Design a protein around this ligand. Structure first.
Ligand SMILES: COc1cccc(-c2c(C(N)=O)[nH]c3ccc(Cl)cc23)c1
Ligand SMILES: [Mn+2]
Ligand SMILES: [Mn+2]
Length: 366
């Protein structure tokens, strides 16, 4: 069984024995003392501890192969003139097929981010959004897949105008730097300091104006847990907590021509149940029904309004506002720098395995 063009064959059909391709395997970086952490690659104890969790790494790998094939497909057709809704639906239809969507066991980890220009993250169109992708737009495609709650958080920036090329190169270099510096027992702030140094070494010229690339300081990389996009540890992208063995990280960087700070803007599209909130009894009928729809379809995974619409739900905005006011659900509005600024993003999911560092979402693209 081989993949079609357009992709339609599920990843688990292409690998029937359930053994999926590994990502990029890296030896851990040397410590601040100078001594190499290379011993882990050949440690018999570490090898045994690594093989014990093979099923887990294997679920990330299936989700990462779906991610690579979905993004390669998106790159072949994404063009100015298409509406943001058309782009997100065409991407998500392919993603649902390749991951072989099956309730909470396999599916979409979070909505398709397609944030534009000064907006860096957490924009996906709601119903009725007539926004059209423009030739001069700088679009961040950030989408997620999962197998048994093992999440792939991976993102790239789309442009059609070469004026943004050095901005894209700066952010890609900063993300790859963050990835290289990551390792077991490495301080989170040391990863952030390395990201910042590389990012700010770039100067770009866009429409006769020059800027020194700034990392967005209130946007950061993070640890990932099962069914938990942000597991509590923060990887800053600027200058005490260490990365630990068996942890999973989203290493992401955002470069900006603006202030290098984002603020909540536009209408909200992204929502997610507070992971720590237990069962809450609700009697309000529309609010109770909506929370049941959320628990059944998303659990602790992120969702968007378009995903409620496709489930045949209507008249839910007040119900959704009630769940947000009660603190059961949290809204995640678009995060934007100043008007007229330009933002870029690159992101990979990395597995801190006992034997090596695996850039599980790495592809031949980025
Ligand atoms: C405590 O939960 C958090 C905190 C900060 C950011 C996120 C988050 C990220 C992320 N950390 O990359 N991606 C998302 C996609 C959709 C939605 Cl609704 C949320 C998020 C989650
Ligand atoms: Mn992301
Ligand atoms: Mn992320």
């Amino acid at each position: 069984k081989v993949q079609t063009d357009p992709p339609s064959v599920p990843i688990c059909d292409l690998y029937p024995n359930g053994v999926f391709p590994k990502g990029q395997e890296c030896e851990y970086p040397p410590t601040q003392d100078g001594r190499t952490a290379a011993w882990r690659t050949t440690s018999e104890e570490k090898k045994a501890l690594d093989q014990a969790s093979e099923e887990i790494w294997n679920d990330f790998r299936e989700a990462a192969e779906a991610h690579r094939q979905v993004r390669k497909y998106v790159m072949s057709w994404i063009k100015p003139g298409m509406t943001m809704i058309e782009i997100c639906e065409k991407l998500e239809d392919c993603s649902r097929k390749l991951i072989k969507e099956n309730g909470l066991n396999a599916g979409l980890a979070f909505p398709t981010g397609c944030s534009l220009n000064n907006c860096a993250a957490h924009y996906t169109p709601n119903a009725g959004d007539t926004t059209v992708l423009q030739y001069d737009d700088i679009c961040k495609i950030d989408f997620g897949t999962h197998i048994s709650g093992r999440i792939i958080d991976c993102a790239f920036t789309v442009t059609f105008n070469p004026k943004y090329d050095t901005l894209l190169k700066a952010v890609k270099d900063a993300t790859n730097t963050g990835i290289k510096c990551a390792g077991i027992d490495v301080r989170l702030c040391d990863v952030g300091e390395a990201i910042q140094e590389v990012m700010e070494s770039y100067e770009v010229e866009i429409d006769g104006k020059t800027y020194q690339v700034k990392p967005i300081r209130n946007l950061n990389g993070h640890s990932i847990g099962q069914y938990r996009i942000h597991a509590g540890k923060t990887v800053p992208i600027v200058k005490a907590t260490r990365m630990e063995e068996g942890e999973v990280y989203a290493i992401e960087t955002f470069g900006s021509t603006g202030k290098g700070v984002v603020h909540d803007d536009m209408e909200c599209s992204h929502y997610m149940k507070n992971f720590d909130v237990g069962h809450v009894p609700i009697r309000l009928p529309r609010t109770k029904h909506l929370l049941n729809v959320i628990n059944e379809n998303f659990g602790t995974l992120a969702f968007c309004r378009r995903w409620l619409d496709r489930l045949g739900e209507s008249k839910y905005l007040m119900a959704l506002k009630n769940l947000c006011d009660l603190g059961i659900v949290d809204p995640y509005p678009p995060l934007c720098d100043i008007k007229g600024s330009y933002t870029a993003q690159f992101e990979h999911t990395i597995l801190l395995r006992p034997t090596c560092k695996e850039v599980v979402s790495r592809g031949d693209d980025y």
